[PDB]
Structure 1
Amino acid sequence: MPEEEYSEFKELILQKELHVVYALSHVCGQDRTLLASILLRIFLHEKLESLLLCTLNDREISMEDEATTLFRATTLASTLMEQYMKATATQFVHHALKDSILKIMESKQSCELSPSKLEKNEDVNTNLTHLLNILSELVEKIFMASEILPPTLRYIYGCLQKSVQHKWPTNTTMRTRVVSGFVFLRLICPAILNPRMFNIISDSPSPIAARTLILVAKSVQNLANLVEFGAKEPYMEGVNPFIKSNKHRMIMFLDELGNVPELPDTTEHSRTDLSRDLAALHEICVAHSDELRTLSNERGAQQHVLKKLLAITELLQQKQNQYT
């Protein structure tokens, strides 16, 4: 239908309490991916991507009863963050990673640290010095790419930081850890493991390049978590000096990544027709009318909106298949 016909449904969805978004995330179990895509396009269109992401992130933080597991599970929140970073952080990812990865793709020099995988005669020591050289150059490129990360994403990171400080006030470690979990575990380290998904690379890595990518991503992830490899990871121990000496640089990077206090937001005016995505979301409400009606029967602050939602869903279904 014409975009205007969805304007009632849309003002419900964009409300600050996000009760419709919460109900939708509930009824959509597996198909988080689809819901995330539609919601992000809608909220992006309206310049309300921060309202969506910041609110969902704070909700996850509030529900977490163990700070060590924060954001580890696959949620709508984490899925939205991944899609959002994918859409906006490409220049950061290229600035951070492209040159290092293209060198690795072209390199004939092994970083193999497992002696048993040496098979036909090379030297782990030589392989370690090389890996440590790769790591130094890379980590410098990542840290100095800080300013390239878009302001809005940095603002969203700053909001994560204020949120975990409030939740765990005597834990002085969370404000860097919560940022690491997005920019490394869910952005940089996946990109090193599969450089194709940010189109850094076009062809599958050679075996030596493939191994180096794995060992580089492993090393970076441990530095990102500010932890040395232990005795259960015996061959990775040679990277421990690198991690130890670089832990403070990692902390400085993660801390300052969120140092955008105010919402930037400026993009002027993006109003292409949105009714296509509004129709997609309406289909979801219709597909789950049964569930949402069950959720609407619960008293509480969400109840007003949800009864309103089912109403709107039925009316748009009237206007749809009406005789004309």
Structure 2
Amino acid sequence: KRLRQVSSLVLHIEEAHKLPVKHFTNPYCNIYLNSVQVAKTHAREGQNPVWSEEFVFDDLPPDINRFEITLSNKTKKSKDPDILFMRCQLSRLQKGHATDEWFLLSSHIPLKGIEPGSLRVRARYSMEKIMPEEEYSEFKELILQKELHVVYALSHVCGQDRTLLASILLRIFLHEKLESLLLCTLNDREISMELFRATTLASTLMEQYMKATATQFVHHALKDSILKIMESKQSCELSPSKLEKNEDVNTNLTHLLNILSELVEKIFMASEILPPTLRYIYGCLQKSVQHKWPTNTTMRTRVVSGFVFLRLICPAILNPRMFNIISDSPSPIAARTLILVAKSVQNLANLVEFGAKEPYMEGVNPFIKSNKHRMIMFLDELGNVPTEHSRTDLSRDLAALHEICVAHSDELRTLSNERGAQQHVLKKLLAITELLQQKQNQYTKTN
């Protein structure tokens, strides 16, 4: 077919400085593409507000030549007034480079000697050139190769592009139903050179994959339990320094044990909702750990609970707002009980009982001790699994990956000149990358 031309504008509204006090008490921003409003920020405090809000405008129509920002005042005395504004032509934005500048503000109204102030905006105006998908065929075949040599090299060359490369690679392997090959091989290599407590490519791939595949396991296991804790008024406090007097610490500990027992049972039963691919990846984690440490017979449960509980379940109990569990913030009593439940679930997932560092928590130890074997059995059965699939814009993501190859070509060249089994494929990757660039030039030359 023909070349795809995709325009995008990312805007970061950071803060404003010395807004006129005579007109601003709760300033907020209106964002326009040309003169058409497309978004707005929240209302912030005072004359020097800080927003730090990001806006992504993908697939810009070809007639967008600028973005404008208008600063209004959120008030109830009248309709919100349009006070100040700036404008920025897209022609001043270097394509692909993220700019960071303060803009002197203009006015919709006479200011009569009052200084307008400034507005700090970060802006990235990008242009993607995407060939038809068939042109990336050989490129795609080299990436989906079974030993992932190109994947290894791309992780080594991307220092700060950890999250972007992971996002693009994850969507590509998901599109090709090969997310198991990607995640299992990288997790196995990660265990082979040691765990997982470092922010590696394997950890952020598992984090992105689990945020996309385990959302309804978390809901089915935690929503009902946390809802009951949200409307509750019975305390679970055990620290004698935080106990308002006339409180029986034994009723509080009894209530905590009833909460933990019902929630732990709910987690064990909601396990059936986990998708089989994620469970298969958990079993591969267990096999890789068993290969490396056949003597650490406890490690096979440690490696799984670190993802299921330490990274997924326990932070969802602590911060249930960021997981679409509950929109309303917890009560101070509900927050305290949630923290106590999370600490207990964490220690149970680690197969350890509270110690002399938390002497007030020893009342949960009998519950933890009697459930440790249930937790071991729960995790071993988790990985006990030996079109409706999630797709993406394949050509777009392949084009984005090729751009990363082009920008890191010389460091990938250093990589191809090292001894190992990855040598030939990295040489092919370089040849394919230059060929794709030559052909992108041909599409651009013929309009």
How many Å separate the matches in 2 of 1:209 and 1:270?
37
Q: Does structure 1 conserve the Cα–Cα contact (< 8 Å) formed by 2:416 and 2:423?
A: yes
Relative to 1, partners in 2 of residues 1:188 and 1:269: Cα closer, same or farther, differing over 3 Å?
closer
Deviation at 1:248, TM superposition (A): 1.2
Deviation at 1:84, TM superposition (A): 1.1
Deviations 1:10-48 (CA, angstroms, capped at 9, x unpaired): 111100010111111111123311111111100000010
Relative to 1, partners in 2 of residues 1:272 and 1:60: Cα closer, same or farther, differing over 3 Å?
closer
Deviation at 1:122, TM superposition (A): 3.2
Q: TM-score, normalised by structure 1?
A: 0.90
Deviation at 1:273, TM superposition (A): 3.9
Q: Does structure 1 conserve the Cα–Cα contact (< 8 Å) formed by 2:171 and 2:391?
A: no
2:353 to 215, 218, 228: 228
Q: Does structure 2 conserve the Cα–Cα contact (< 8 Å) formed by 1:112 and 1:118?
A: yes
Q: Whose helix fraction is larger, Structure 1's or Structure 2's?
A: 1
Q: Determine helix, strand or coil for the equivalent of 1:111.
A: coil
Pairwise CA RMSD: 1.8
Question: Who is 1:299 aligned against?
Answer: 419
> Which stretch shows the higher mean deviation, 123-132 or 222-231?
123-132
> Which stretch shows the higher mean deviation, 149-158 or 165-174?
165-174
Question: Who is 1:39 aligned against?
Answer: 169
Q: Does structure 1 conserve the Cα–Cα contact (< 8 Å) formed by 2:174 and 2:391?
A: no
Q: Determine helix, strand or coil for the equivalent of 2:389.
A: coil
Deviation at 1:144, TM superposition (A): 1.4
Deviations 1:246-299 (CA, angstroms, capped at 9, x unpaired): 1111111011111111xxxxxx67766411111222222223223222222212
Deviation at 1:189, TM superposition (A): 1.1
Question: Who is 1:310 aligned against?
Answer: 430
Deviation at 1:219, TM superposition (A): 0.7
Relative to 1, partners in 2 of residues 1:199 and 1:13: Cα closer, same or farther, differing over 3 Å?
same
Give the percent of matched residue pairs that are identical in Structure 1 and Structure 2: 100
Name the structure, 1 or 2, with higher relative contact order (CA <8 Å, separation 6+). Answer: 1
Deviation at 1:49, TM superposition (A): 0.4
Question: Who is 1:8 aligned against?
Answer: 138
Q: Determine helix, strand or coil for the equivalent of 2:353.
A: coil
Relative to 1, partners in 2 of residues 1:85 and 1:173: Cα closer, same or farther, differing over 3 Å?
same
Relative to 1, partners in 2 of residues 1:189 and 1:295: Cα closer, same or farther, differing over 3 Å?
same
Q: Does structure 2 conserve the Cα–Cα contact (< 8 Å) formed by 1:12 and 1:305?
A: yes
Q: Does structure 2 conserve the Cα–Cα contact (< 8 Å) formed by 1:61 and 1:164?
A: yes
Q: Determine helix, strand or coil for the equivalent of 1:260.
A: coil
Is structure 2 residue 315 aligned with structure 1 residue 195? no
Q: Does structure 2 conserve the Cα–Cα contact (< 8 Å) formed by 1:3 and 1:273?
A: no
Relative to 1, partners in 2 of residues 1:307 and 1:245: Cα closer, same or farther, differing over 3 Å?
same
Q: Determine helix, strand or coil for the equivalent of 1:139.
A: helix
Is structure 2 residue 281 aligned with structure 1 residue 156? yes
Gaps (5+ residues) in structure 2? 1-130
Q: Determine helix, strand or coil for the equivalent of 1:251.
A: helix
Deviation at 1:113, TM superposition (A): 1.9
How many Å separate the matches in 2 of 1:50 and 1:140?
29
Q: Does structure 1 conserve the Cα–Cα contact (< 8 Å) formed by 2:174 and 2:389?
A: no
Q: Does structure 1 conserve the Cα–Cα contact (< 8 Å) formed by 2:172 and 2:392?
A: no
Q: Does structure 1 conserve the Cα–Cα contact (< 8 Å) formed by 2:149 and 2:425?
A: yes
How many Å separate the matches in 2 of 1:72 and 1:43?
24
Relative to 1, partners in 2 of residues 1:180 and 1:271: Cα closer, same or farther, differing over 3 Å?
closer
The structure having more radius of gyration, on CA atoms, is: 2
Gaps (5+ residues) in structure 1? 64-69, 262-267
| Matched positions, count | 312
How many Å separate the matches in 1 of 2:181 and 2:431?
25
> Which stretch shows the higher mean deviation, 29-38 or 220-229?
29-38
How many Å separate the matches in 2 of 1:114 and 1:28?
47
Q: TM-score, normalised by structure 2?
A: 0.66
Q: Determine helix, strand or coil for the equivalent of 1:145.
A: helix
Q: Does structure 2 conserve the Cα–Cα contact (< 8 Å) formed by 1:113 and 1:236?
A: yes
How many Å separate the matches in 2 of 1:271 and 1:239?
45
Q: Determine helix, strand or coil for the equivalent of 1:144.
A: helix
Question: Who is 1:58 aligned against?
Answer: 188
How many Å separate the matches in 1 of 2:263 and 2:389?
37
Q: Whose strand fraction is larger, Structure 1's or Structure 2's?
A: 2
How many Å separate the matches in 1 of 2:286 and 2:262?
28
Relative to 1, partners in 2 of residues 1:286 and 1:205: Cα closer, same or farther, differing over 3 Å?
farther
